[PDB]
Amino acid sequence: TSISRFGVNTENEDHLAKELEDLNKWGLNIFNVAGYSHNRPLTCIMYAIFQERDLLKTFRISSDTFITYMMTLEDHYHSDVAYHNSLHAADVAQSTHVLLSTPALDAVFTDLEILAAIFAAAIHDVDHPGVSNQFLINTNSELALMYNDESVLENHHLAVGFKLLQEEHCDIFMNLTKKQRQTLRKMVIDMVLATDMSKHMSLLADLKTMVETKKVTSSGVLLLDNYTDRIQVLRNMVHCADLSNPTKSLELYRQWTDRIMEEFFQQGDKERERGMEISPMCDKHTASVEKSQVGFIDYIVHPLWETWADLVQPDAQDILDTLEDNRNWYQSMIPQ
Ligand SMILES: CN(C)C(=O)c1cccc(S(=O)(=O)N2CCC[C@H]2C(=O)O[C@@H](Cc2c(Cl)c[n+](O)cc2Cl)c2ccc(OC(F)F)c(OCC3CC3)c2)c1
Ligand SMILES: [Mg+2]
Ligand SMILES: [Zn+2]
């Protein structure tokens, strides 16, 4: 009955259960969850999140339909891609789960909005080929042609996550009302489209203008009046979870950095063999891993998370302290 307890099959139930004590914490170790779940971290963590939040009961999803859909989704993440594989998706889903329960956001979101955000996080990189939108554009990929060069992969992650609902015994949304399905689909599209880094500067600028005029209860909880403000917060939340690696404990962050660099270098080798110019950050002969992380934190991660932390103050205090310390550590590790 480990299938009834967990998403999944494992003989080391005690160890998996110990890791999952941290389900609601930023300090969860998703590498260990993967080790104790026969490398099904996405199925295992999603089943745990849905049990924890009572989402199967709320939306009348049988455990069989949910497990079937998650196993199929996880199968459609490529295990030969070094970073954008189901461990990443599992991490983003679990990080989203933690951020939804930030105290400044208590009682703000409906159950449909919670369901939408965790599902968007789970599907947001499905069927990633391990090369960038600009690679696909530069090689005249059918995917780039079909979406007119715009949010190429992100459009494709949506198309695959939604198509898999149509597989036998996979429709996790079968018992939502018609209107609830229409609203969830729109929300999920908005959140997955907001993971395209080409949109980051405009997302952040909007988020800042939102912090400027936020309303807060005594208790310090945010009042988010309308739909438009709620989906703005949710698009940024999923984006923050996608950009969360450098805010994790250093031992986790180092493992994420090893993986994104291996995936970049494998792209650069494909470029080189094709007689193409090698994309920035993808030439293993010239990369400076530690310099590059400091830049990434200074120009992208830290401005995003300081703004997020302003919105949910003081909830993200420890996240910012960890981020700053990891920045200093990587800078200190620049060779010479
Ligand atoms: C193959 N190429 C090189 C590309 O695709 C690429 C080329 C030009 C621009 C961009 S970019 O997306 O505008 N952009 C700018 C900064 C780095 C990167 C970024 O945010 O990347 C995320 C992952 C990511 C990607 Cl790839 C694509 N989208 O859409 C969204 C995301 Cl969320 C990430 C995560 C973790 C990282 O490290 C650690 F924390 F593990 C990490 O470190 C990167 C190394 C260089 C320091 C990077 C990507
Ligand atoms: Mg992506
Ligand atoms: Zn991602």
From Swiss-Prot:
Binding site for Zn(2+) 1: H88, H124, D125, D242
Catalytic machinery residues: H84 (proton donor)
Residues annotated to bind 3',5'-cyclic AMP: H84, Q293, F296
Annotated positions binding Mg(2+): D125
Positions with a binding annotation for Mn(2+): D125
Residue span, PDEase domain: 8-336
Chain residues that bind Zn(2+) 2: D125
Family the entry assigns: Belongs to the cyclic nucleotide phosphodiesterase family. PDE4 subfamily.
Function, as annotated: Hydrolyzes the second messenger cAMP, which is a key regulator of many important physiological processes. May be involved in mediating central nervous system effects of therapeutic agents ranging from antidepressants to antiasthmatic and anti-inflammatory agents.
Protein name in UniProt: 3',5'-cyclic-AMP phosphodiesterase 4B
Organism: Homo sapiens
Lineage, broadest ranks: Eukaryota, Metazoa, Chordata, Craniata, Vertebrata
Gene: PDE4B
Shown segment, full-protein numbering: 323 to 658 of 736
